[PDB]
Amino acid sequence: LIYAVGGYDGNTHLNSVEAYDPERNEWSLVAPLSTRRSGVGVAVLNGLIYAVGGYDGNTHLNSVEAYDPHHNEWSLVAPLSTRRSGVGVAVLNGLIYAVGGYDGNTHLNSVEAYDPERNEWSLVAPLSTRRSGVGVAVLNGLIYAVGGYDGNTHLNSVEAYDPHHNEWSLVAPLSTRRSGVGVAVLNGLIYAVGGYDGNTHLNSVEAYDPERNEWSLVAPLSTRRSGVGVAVLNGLIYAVGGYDGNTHLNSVEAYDPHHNEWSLVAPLSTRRSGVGVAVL
Fold it and tell me: How far apart are CA 107 and CA 172, in angstroms?
């Protein structure tokens, strides 16, 4: 299932959570979060969905909660060291990494890692650049931080974290500055989906080949989408919700890399931008 967690429907921040079953092309609502959360990072570890940070409408959040699908329950665990909305979240070597974000009064280059065995976050090497609205994914044992916003420019830059040496290094930038970008890994490529370049919301999509350190543009989305959640299921990339510039979206579309095409599927129950999306 694809879980869509939190977000913003235009006129309220959401604690609701819904799950997509591709076999029936249906979304259904499950247990909500303890707290409304938009700009939330969402990752899967040891059979739980972790919802990390976010914005509840009136404060940026350091709290973290984990969803157990066997009991349809969220439970709060150890909070981040820093409030983080617009945070990117990925799983590597059994840790959850929280990458960048916005604490309310500064955009963050800091990065911290959660160990579920000890219920603790610890700070590791920071990014080269402050990044909120950053997309994060894991490929070949590295964490890639893709685009974002440093406070005073939207970013096309991309950097990769090597946990063996606790270091980030900059690689090839995107073709287009992208904040609020969704990122996922499929067939050994990183896809950067939509986002916002500073002066337009984007429908474009580009794929990174680490063997050649190159991004290349592929088929665009049907709709411009920033603040979009992206996940991979059954060999398709799903782009979930987002914001097209002039409406928040409930629509969902799926990318087939074999035919280089997106197609619209069942929409969410509610419009959701800044939504976190994970597969469990």
Answer: 22
Two tokens at 269? Answer: 């129950």
Of 237, 269, 242, the C-alpha closest to 253 is 237
CATH of the domain at 223: 2.120.10.80
Domain extent at residue 137 = 2-279
Radius of gyration for the alpha carbons in the chain, expressed in angstroms and rounded = 17
Distance between start and end Cα atoms, the chain: 5
Nearest-CA neighbor of 123 among 134, 108, 136? Answer: 108
Q: How far apart are CA 208 and CA 73, in angstroms?
A: 36
Nearest to 169 by CA among 177, 181, 157: 157
Instruction: Tell me how far apart the alpha carbons of residues 41 and 168 are, in angstroms, rounded to a whole number.
Output: 20
CA-nearest of 205, 208, 237, 200 to 220 is: 205
- Comparing CA positions, the residue from 142, 152, 153, 236 lying closest to residue 187 is 236
Domains identified in the chain, total number: 1
The answer to whether the beta carbons of residues 64 and 87 sit under 8 Å apart is no
CB-based contact 15:32 (threshold 8 Å): yes
CB-based contacts of 77, cutoff 8 Å, min separation 6: 50, 64, 65, 66, 119
Q: Find residue 238's DSSP bridge partners.
A: 231, 254
Task: Return d(Cα 180, Cα 76) in angstroms, integer.
Answer: 26
Single-letter code of the amino acid located at 151: G
Q: Are strands 276-279 and 182-186 parallel, antiparallel or unpaired?
A: unpaired
Identity (one letter) of the amino acid at 23? E
CA nearest neighbour of 145 among 218, 77, 90, 83:
90
Q: What resolution in Å is listed for this PDB structure? A: 1.5
Q: Tokens for 278?
A: 């994970």
Phi, psi at residue 157, to the nearest 5°?
-75, 160
Angle ∠(147,152,154) on CA atoms, nearest 5: 25
